Structures are given as structure tokens and as C-alpha cells.
Amino acid sequence: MPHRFKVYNYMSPTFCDHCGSLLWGLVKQGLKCEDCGMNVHHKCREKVANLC
Template identity: 60%
Template sequence: TVEDFQIRPHALFVHSYRAPAFCDHCGEMLWGLVRQGLKCEGCGLNYHKRCAFKIPNNCSGIRKRRLSNVSLTGLTNTRSVSAEP
């Protein structure tokens, strides 16, 4: 359908994270003390400034939260869930 091919650009703005965060494009950590990366106002995904030019125009407009469960072995299991705006 036509809706499948809509261009939905991300609304990115510079963001300072209080806890470790990772780029939702490349998966690497966002480094620094302040202004570490870009966050999409629509869907809440995080990106490096260097990755911003590579991400597709597919903003869902639905914010997602990441829930982490740390096991006793120190491994982290992460899953995404939709959050109501």
C-alpha cells in the first residue's frame, strides 16, 4: 500500500544521557559526559551524530522503552516494548 512507502523522517535533537546509552543504528555506546548523541522526538530512538546521515526515514512516532534484566552472571537481556505517549 501507499502507507508502506511513506517518508517519515526522524525529528532528531541533541540529548545528554544520565545513564549509558547505545546507538540504535550501529549498536555502539554513545560516549561523553554531555551531549553524547541524538534522540528522536517522535520514536525516542538514540543515534550517534555520525550515524544520523545513515538512518532510514522510517520514524514510527511510537516511543519505545527498553527494559533490561540483569542476570546473576552479569549478562544483560534487553527487549523493547511500546509505551503509550
């Protein structure tokens, strides 16, 4: 099954689970998958294997 990513407002300095880099910003810094919890950049969404 595919991931179900949803824009998320990170609070704690959080890193992308795909590319390893920090999720920059105050709000809406990245996507958290609603089913498995994985955090990714908006730009890294298309870059991850879509098996959740």
C-alpha cells in the same frame, strides 16, 4: 515521515540504535528522536532509514 533528531544529554550508559556502540561523553553524547525515542550517534544520523 522522517525522524526529528534532537541533541540529548544521556545519563545512563546508552548505546546507538544504528551501530550498537556506546554513546561516549558527559553531555550531548548523541541524538534522541523527538517522535519515536530512537538514540543515535551524531555520525550515524545520516546512516538510518528516515521513516519514523
